[PDB]
């Protein structure tokens, strides 16, 4: 304590960003997608959002007891006051961070660019997305850089609904010729949205009326 809330709330943010960049670098080979911290009294806890939890949770408790030590050594936590959980991913076909790492590692196995990228867009469409778009930019097959974009569905990128329905991820893939850039935008449809708005702002639905009987039989019914 003894720190102002202005410096306290900012320091919580930079602590989160340092953790997130650590796990992108460390759990790159396990399909990592994000973290969230739950600052509680008595052992603040950290959850790791990675597809293959059977790999993140190593043999007999290794590979996450190691990461528990690595965090509390670097951030000077007391022992036992931080624990690391790994629940897997909510529908990995719709996360742009996870689908960019999939796009990255498919490129590093020497897959053709047009095949590795059409295999990502069609998987995201299979996952119930309304539109997604993959951009590969760099020196693709020549010495002069170009940019290829692969799209399906539709995407909106205009306003506040971008903050609601767009997930973006940028990845640097390191090649023999140089560096290629991977950009994945995924627009999850608002119909399956659980929280927040559930429709686009200019979408109107009219409740269909039920037709009535004309004469309606002028009379009285009593009790």
């Amino acid at each position: 304590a003894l720190i102002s809330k202005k410096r306290k709330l900012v320091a919580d943010g930079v602590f989160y960003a340092e953790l997130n960049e650590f796990f992108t670098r460390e759990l790159a080979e396990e399909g990592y997608s994000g973290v969230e911290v739950r600052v509680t009294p008595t052992k603040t806890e950290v959850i790791i959002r990675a597809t293959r939890t059977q790999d993140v949770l190593g043999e007999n408790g290794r590979r996450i007891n190691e990461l528990t030590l690595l965090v509390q050594k670097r951030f000077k936590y007391a022992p036992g006051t931080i624990v690391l959980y790994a629940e897997r991913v909510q529908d990995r076909g719709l996360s742009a961070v996870a689908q960019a790492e999939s796009m990255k590692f498919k490129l590093l196995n020497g897959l053709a660019i047009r095949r590795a990228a059409y295999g990502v867009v069609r998987y995201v469409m299979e996952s119930g997305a309304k539109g997604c778009e993959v951009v590969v930019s760099g020196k693709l097959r020549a010495a002069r850089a170009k940019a290829m974009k692969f799209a399906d569905g539709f995407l909106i990128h205009s306003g506040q609904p971008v903050n609601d329905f767009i997930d973006t991820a940028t990845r640097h893939v390191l090649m023999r010729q140089g560096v290629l850039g991977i950009k994945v935008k995924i627009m999850r449809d608002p119909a399956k949205s659980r929280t927040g708005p559930k429709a686009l702002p200019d979408a109107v639905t009219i409740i269909e009326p039920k037709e009535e009987e004309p004469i309606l039989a002028p009379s009285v019914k009593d009790y």
């Binding site: 080979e29 399909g31 597809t51 293959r52 076909g93 790492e101 999939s102 590692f105 498919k106 590093l108 196995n109 020497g110 897959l111 095949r115 590795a116 295999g119 998987y123």
Partner: protein, 111 residues
């Protein structure tokens, strides 16, 4: 495969397996052409033949500390001098044709 049966199975029939190959005739072999489909249809990340743990460390010295340089060594195997550079300790995906020419040009029998 190679003359084990392809003449013995040709006893007055003359057609079993006479179809044409893939058809490059100077582009390299298809030793990973099977694995290229598997990384295409599997919608996750797979690890590409991770590293060269001791075939890097031990065979760099037996090849190059003997007489030679990598600028010389990459010239007789016909690859760029950074290809041998990433076969030195780590940081490569090892393919068969490059690793075969690495073996037959300098003798050390580690694959």
């Amino acid at each position: 495969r190679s003359q084990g049966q392809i003449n013995a199975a040709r006893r007055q029939g003359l057609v079993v397996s006479v179809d044409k190959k893939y058809g490059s005739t100077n582009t390299r072999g298809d030793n990973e052409g099977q694995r290229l489909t598997k990384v295409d249809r599997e919608t996750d990340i797979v690890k590409p033949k991770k590293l060269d743990p001791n075939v890097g460390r031990a065979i760099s010295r037996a090849r190059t500390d003997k007489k030679m340089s990598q600028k010389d060594l990459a010239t007789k195997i016909n690859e760029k001098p950074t290809v041998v550079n990433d076969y030195e300790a780590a940081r490569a995906i090892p393919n068969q044709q490059v690793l075969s020419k690495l073996e037959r040009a300098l003798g050390v029998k580690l694959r």
